[PDB]
Amino acid sequence: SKVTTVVATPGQGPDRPQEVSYTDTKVIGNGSFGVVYQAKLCDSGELVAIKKVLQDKRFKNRELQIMRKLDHCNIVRLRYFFYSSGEVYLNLVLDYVPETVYRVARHYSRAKQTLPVIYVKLYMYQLFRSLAYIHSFGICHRDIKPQNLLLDPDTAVLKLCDFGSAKQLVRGEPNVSYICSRYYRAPELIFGATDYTSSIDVWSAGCVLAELLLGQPIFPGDSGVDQLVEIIKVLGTPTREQIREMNPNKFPQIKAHPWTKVFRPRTPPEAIALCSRLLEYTPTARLTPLEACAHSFFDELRDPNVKLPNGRDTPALFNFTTQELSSNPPLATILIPPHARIQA
Ligand SMILES: Cc1cc(C2=NC(=O)N=C(c3ccccc3)C2)ccc1O
């Protein structure tokens, strides 16, 4: 059948051009940005995703610059990239990953069931690890939502993706406030703040968690006004102090709504506590990605005996690097459990 052979630049290694052949090119996503194809590498027979985007010669592609410097087991890896036509197109060859949290959470949803807590723990933890990692380089995803969380059903491994909105956030510089999707935007973004920090990613992550527990989005609405009301129903009315810290220079005064009332009965208290600590009005009061990994809701993953429902072992969860722990090294004493310290 058809066989394409291109010369590509490795994702991270030194610029030693590679010859890459692949066939079976079917489409797997469309969007303002461009297209994403699934393809099968001729040699190894491995599947890959190729993300074709328009290359605006005027500048260097920011998605590319950010992806080239990332290397983490919970982030889709960029293998090689190459330019071409279809009038200049940039093509990113990334690892192929079967499902997405969006799809998975949906199969349980239109079946009146919820994703087994053990999976919520595994997936949420890996998301937080990936955030702790990119945040250490000063990079903010800015579009954390279920659809950008890829999953391998079998291994229970999660990989963050879509860095098309990602950006190095330098304190003092302003950034557009129209990033991030409907249900997952942090309050300060809705209020149009221009000086937001990486915490917006934590708020998004919090919405993902809450969603996996509830079986539906926690803060829906077709408009900002509607989303704010849903937020206020749960967190209550923001004191002026908080409205201030969200920055932007007047709503149905409602009070504290105990989060246990929010989740199904039987929801673990720890899950509820972790939410309350992520979904906070004041951006600086939210846990950091690393602090979240060390939260008690994840203690079960730190148990020597824990196994996946299908009997296999849990993925690599403690191979932390100094880079990852840099936001707060002392945490390592919790993030890396004893049995992970046994030498032999
Ligand atoms: C299956 C798979 C998908 C992706 C996507 N990356 C992206 O930036 N954007 C994606 C997208 C898909 C549909 C519509 C819009 C964006 C998909 C990366 C690696 C993979 O292994």
UniProtKB/Swiss-Prot annotation:
Residues in Protein kinase domain copies: 22-298
GO MF, one example: protein serine kinase activity
Key words of the record: ADP-ribosylation, Alzheimer disease, ATP-binding, Biological rhythms, Carbohydrate metabolism, Cell membrane, Cytoplasm, Developmental protein, Diabetes mellitus, Differentiation, Glycogen metabolism, Kinase, Lipoprotein, Membrane, Neurogenesis, Nucleotide-binding, Nucleus, Palmitate, Phosphoprotein, Serine/threonine-protein kinase, Signal transduction inhibitor, Transferase, Wnt signaling pathway
Family to which this protein belongs: Belongs to the protein kinase superfamily. CMGC Ser/Thr protein kinase family. GSK-3 subfamily.
Effect caused by changing residue 90 to A: Abolishes activity toward AXIN1
Source organism per UniProt: Homo sapiens (Human)
Quaternary organization: Monomer. Interacts with ARRB2, DISC1 and ZBED3. Interacts with CABYR, MMP2, MUC1, NIN and PRUNE1. Interacts with AXIN1; the interaction mediates hyperphosphorylation of CTNNB1 leading to its ubiquitination and destruction. Interacts with and phosphorylates SNAI1. Interacts with DNM1L (via a C-terminal domain). Found in a complex composed of MACF1, APC, AXIN1, CTNNB1 and GSK3B. Interacts with SGK3. Interacts with DAB2IP (via C2 domain); the interaction stimulates GSK3B kinase activation. Interacts (via C2 domain) with PPP2CA. Interacts with the CLOCK-BMAL1 heterodimer.
Protein's UniProt name: Glycogen synthase kinase-3 beta
Post-translational modification: Phosphorylated by AKT1 and ILK1. Upon insulin-mediated signaling, the activated PKB/AKT1 protein kinase phosphorylates and deactivates GSK3B, resulting in the dephosphorylation and activation of GYS1. Activated by phosphorylation at Tyr-178. Phosphorylated in a circadian manner in the hippocampus.
Tissues in which the protein is found: Expressed in testis, thymus, prostate and ovary and weakly expressed in lung, brain and kidney. Colocalizes with EIF2AK2/PKR and TAU in the Alzheimer disease (AD) brain.
Protein purpose: Constitutively active protein kinase that acts as a negative regulator in the hormonal control of glucose homeostasis, Wnt signaling and regulation of transcription factors and microtubules, by phosphorylating and inactivating glycogen synthase (GYS1 or GYS2), EIF2B, CTNNB1/beta-catenin, APC, AXIN1, DPYSL2/CRMP2, JUN, NFATC1/NFATC, MAPT/TAU and MACF1. Requires primed phosphorylation of the majority of its substrates. In skeletal muscle, contributes to insulin regulation of glycogen synthesis by phosphorylating and inhibiting GYS1 activity and hence glycogen synthesis.
Main subcellular location of this protein, as a coarse class: cytoplasm
Compartments reported by the entry: Cytoplasm; Nucleus; Cell membrane
Location of this fragment in the whole protein: 35 to 386 of 420
Residues the record lists as binding ATP: 28-36, 51
Residues annotated as the enzyme's active site: 143
Residues modified as Phosphotyrosine: 178
Misc. remarks from the entry: Higher expression and activity of GSK3B are found in the skeletal muscle (vastus lateralis) of patients with type 2 diabetes. Several potent GSK3 (GSK3A and GSK3B) inhibitors have been identified and characterized in preclinical models for treatments of type 2 diabetes.
Regulation: Activated by phosphorylation at Tyr-178. Inhibited by lithium.
Catalytic activity entry: L-seryl-[tau protein] + ATP = O-phospho-L-seryl-[tau protein] + ADP + H(+); L-threonyl-[tau protein] + ATP = O-phospho-L-threonyl-[tau protein] + ADP + H(+); L-seryl-[protein] + ATP = O-phospho-L-seryl-[protein] + ADP + H(+); L-threonyl-[protein] + ATP = O-phospho-L-threonyl-[protein] + ADP + H(+)
Single GO biological process annotation from the record: positive regulation of proteasomal ubiquitin-dependent protein catabolic process
